[PDB]
Nucleic acid binder design. Structure first.
Ligand SMILES: [Mg+2]
Ligand SMILES: [Mg+2]
Ligand SMILES: [Mg+2]
Ligand SMILES: [Mg+2]
Ligand SMILES: [N+]
Ligand SMILES: [N+]
Ligand SMILES: [Zn+2]
Ligand SMILES: [Zn+2]
Lengths: 365, 163, 365, 163
DNA sequence: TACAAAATTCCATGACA
DNA sequence: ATTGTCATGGAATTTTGTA
DNA sequence: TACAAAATTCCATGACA
DNA sequence: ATTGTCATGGAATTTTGTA
């Protein structure tokens, strides 16, 4: 219909003049620098783009190079990109080519016992019947308590924490969404005590970086202390706990013990700088030391990052993807942007999920 | 010269035997001489070994320069003596039958016994689970001298469980 | 002995004047901006440094901050660094803080059949009794053949390759050091035919990047073709093979098929640009297309990279490190530097290993 | 106009029955009309299904525009016909008893029969393992017209196994 | 008012998940 | 509904002891 | 001899192990 | 004795159609 006009030499928005358009084999053709190409009717173009894309589910250029072998028409990539955005399979299977924005560097908690970070390490090689370690880190000080468990369970956590909170009670405990902390038994244990439970976005251990980072150190220390020997870690936990708590952070110029108590215990190489200050003088030197501690800032954004915008289509990453199955969930909308790195989505379908952008990719096209 | 500091001196003593709670019978009582802070460990006997298992837990968080106690058999043994020499703790004994410890510690050690009895009646057998609650109470109780709580003197902040 | 001189006010290289040095408790002391510190005899210093380091096996500054609590002496870190370099445990357990130099970008093979890259994908979900895929990629062209196997075995490889090399015989086949290619049965199969076997440095699949990169594409394509459906991949292999071989590389502007044959088969959207050239004209347009293909160059080095030097001490990474055991092998010497990214070491102990620098760290101190 | 090209036309035929090697009996023979390149697939019968299984392997590396054959029952069936329409291959039949294929292909199809017999005697039953060797030999044999080998015309380079 | 060398700080790198 | 962290050891910078 | 928009190229990002 | 690779899709650049 609209192709009729052309061979008759009249102009159409899109189809440049200077190229002659002719009829052969009942198809409309055009002579082009590249060669002689067929111009399909507009009603055929969607189907053509689809056939090209379907051969291997190729992206823009690779799909376009096929089509260009045989056809020409105005704004081919515009049509190519339309299919790509409607290909359910390409959408849920392709990798992202855009990085998350720069990580945040959440404020150090103001005082000890404000926030506890907690996690289980393990399974470890059996020691005295024990397989796991409960690791509890005070956010402010880095002070760490270690408890050996037989399983990463609520009951083990509750037993361990009743021992710890027999010394002080935290305002907040932060954990990942592991079974042991998301149980309602744990919630009640916390509500009994006025502790607030705060969980990391699913499958994002960066959010528990304080503890995860501490797990590294524990494991590294156990490793060294166990070279040559059979892995009898159970007896070493106390030693490790003590050793780590009294270890200097080169950047802070303090040990966790120091930050918690403002004086050293009777341990090797104990610092004596405050021997002449009264406890009170010492304790306000401490209040001053705590508020003045180095705080890192967020890094530059990488050249090609994205940040989440309310109303944007994003896709959540598939957690435990079976073999030969899509790494991505179907598209969902950003409902709220909590901070530039955490987001609420209306998912599958439809419940609210609070989600890390690292487990998101923006839907392309 | 040196003003009194935390970890300078831990006074330890045993309370017991008590009615059996979770098959435990005694409470090792550790009080920090300067702050009045108090740790309680439930043991099965007033023995060197029970004392060492308990104190191993405490000393993996802070080691006192000095432990002071009475001449209870558990503290005067040479196992306990070799234990403290290992960790460079000095042992200090009060003379027998004349058990002196500072004024503040006596008043604390008194609060405990009463605090225990007041809740070790009505429920004389469920006292094991209450040790955490007891400990917090003690450690967040105002000293009429200083009017800082042991918690405050220890950590230099207010606590999230005031009393 | 050497400490005697000091209190008597005479000078010693190292010990600055202006600070007064005095005797107390039979120990020699010094008044310093920091405070009053003990100067141990030189015969005690090694032991002291060792005790500090041993508490948690800390590095330079953290070890130094302990010691500085009690002691002072000239050039403390010099002594600290001496222990760190002799701590077997710290050496075999600590992470590296220095990146490998920039990757190399080995020349594209000059012609098809010059070099085959080969690897097994799998296990995959059982299909018709098959679990693995033999993937063979021609280096020059990217052309890929796919064979389904029941195991990643020599016999399977030999069966599959007798079918392939019934069309052409390669000069070189490159593989990783997987059991199926390092068997002597495979060597003989290759020697029978004049094929050279070339293996990647152990545990370094970047070295087989041509195939590994191709595995991605196969898996991604299977995934899309299997969305919704049960994972019946066995019937799809031929389709995938064909689809991929006739897929354009956006950067080359050619398909592997094109690079291998210099004309398209009878597949959808076949390119016709050479319809008028005789086979001969076409075949020399091909010789020209092959030699002119884009070749990537090596990236800039990162700020803190290292390159291997003959005689340098390095440590090979422990392949399958048990739980709570050192991630590194004991130190070994670089014997030859094959290229800036591949090295020969005299190992444990002592056989020659040809090794990728990515699996090396330089021994610190 | 268009000069002759690879993949323009594949001539297929069956050789057999042969003495059983690995329980196979026939050889489907595919020769590319322009290059003279030759693929050989061993089948258990001269049947549509054997032909399709074999040709499925070849056509997953290159699809001919045209397959030409004799009116053998296997090629004239409507299964084979529906197979080729699926892949957009046109089927072309030589008239019965007057089986024409280009001069170059006849000479090739002749070489094969002889090449086979010359090594299908002495070892009449081990011919399955020899198919790879036979194929290479054929494909790297100089054409007296062109003096390019099928390998060279197909891939446009010299081969690593010359003959 | 300046030097060389020691001391301190900076900071990329990698590992905890 | 919430959020990366930090020991390590060369290199870069700043401080020190002496003039 | 210069414009806006389409076409093409660039290239970081991530995934194969 | 050996060595990273490259599809993807926004953004950046260059080419095009018309003047
Ligand atoms: Mg966890
Ligand atoms: Mg007593
Ligand atoms: Mg492999
Ligand atoms: Mg016949
Ligand atoms: N924050
Ligand atoms: N190379
Ligand atoms: Zn698709
Ligand atoms: Zn060490």
């Amino acid at each position: 219909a609209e192709l009729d006009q052309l061979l008759q030499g009249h102009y159409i928005k899109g189809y440049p003049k200077q190229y002659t358009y002719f009829l052969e084999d009942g198809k409309v053709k055009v002579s082009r620098p590249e060669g002689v190409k067929i111009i399909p009717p507009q009603s055929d173009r969607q189907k053509i783009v689809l056939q090209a894309h379907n051969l291997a589910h190729t992206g823009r250029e690779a799909t376009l190079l096929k089509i260009a072998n045989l056809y020409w028409w105005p704004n081919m990539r515009k049509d190519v990109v339309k299919q790509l955005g409607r290909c359910q399979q390409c959408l849920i299977t392709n990798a992202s080519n855009k990085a998350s924005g720069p990580i945040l560097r959440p404020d150090r908690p103001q005082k000890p016992f404000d926030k506890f970070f907690i996690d289980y390490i393990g399974p470890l090689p059996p020691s005295q019947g024990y397989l796991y370690v409960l690791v509890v880190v005070d956010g402010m000080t880095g002070f760490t308590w270690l408890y050996p468990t037989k399983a990463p369970s609520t009951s083990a956590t509750v037993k361990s924490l009743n021992v710890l909170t027999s010394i002080a009670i935290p305002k907040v405990i932060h954990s990942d969404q592991g079974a042991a902390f998301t149980s309602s038994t744990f919630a009640e244990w916390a509500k009994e005590r006025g502790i607030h439970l705060e969980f990391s976005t699913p499958y994002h251990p960066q959010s528990s970086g304080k503890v995860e980072r501490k797990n590294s150190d524990i494991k590294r220390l156990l490793t060294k202390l166990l070279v040559g020997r059979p892995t009898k870690w159970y007896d070493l936990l106390p030693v490790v706990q003590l050793a780590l708590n009294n270890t200097y952070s080169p950047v802070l110029k303090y040990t966790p013990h120091q930050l918690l108590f403002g004086i050293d215990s009777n341990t090797p190489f104990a610092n004596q700088d405050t021997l002449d200050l009264t406890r009170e003088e010492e304790l306000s030197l401490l209040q001053e030391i705590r508020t003045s501690l180095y705080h890192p800032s967020t890094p530059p954004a990488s050249s090609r990052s994205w940040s989440p915008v309310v109303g944007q289509l994003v896709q959540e990453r598939v957690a435990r993807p079976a073999s030969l199955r899509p790494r991505w969930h179907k598209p969902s909308t950003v409902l709220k942007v909590l901070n530039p790195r955490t987001v609420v989505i209306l998912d599958h379908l439809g419940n609210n999920r609070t989600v890390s952008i690292d487990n998101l990719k923006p839907t392309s096209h | 010269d040196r003003p009194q500091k935390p970890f300078d001196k831990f006074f330890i003593d045993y309370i017991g035997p008590l009615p059996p709670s979770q098959g435990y019978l005694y409470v090792l009582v550790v009080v920090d001489g300067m702050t009045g802070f108090t740790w309680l460990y439930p043991t099965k006997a007033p023995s060197t070994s029970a004392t060492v298992k308990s104190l191993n837990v405490l000393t993996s968080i802070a080691i006192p320069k000095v432990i002071h106690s009475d001449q209870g058999a558990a503290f005067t043994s040479s196992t306990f003596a070799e234990w403290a020499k290992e960790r460079g703790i000095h042992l200090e004994f009060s003379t027998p039958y004349h058990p002196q410890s500072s004024g503040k510690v006596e008043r604390k050690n008194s609060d405990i016994k009463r605090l225990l009895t007041k809740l070790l009646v009505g429920r004389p057998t469920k006292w094991y689970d209450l040790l955490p609650v007891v400990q917090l109470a003690l450690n967040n109780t105002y000293s009429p001298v200083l009017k800082y709580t042991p918690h405050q003197l220890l950590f230099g902040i207010d606590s999230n469980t005031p009393f």
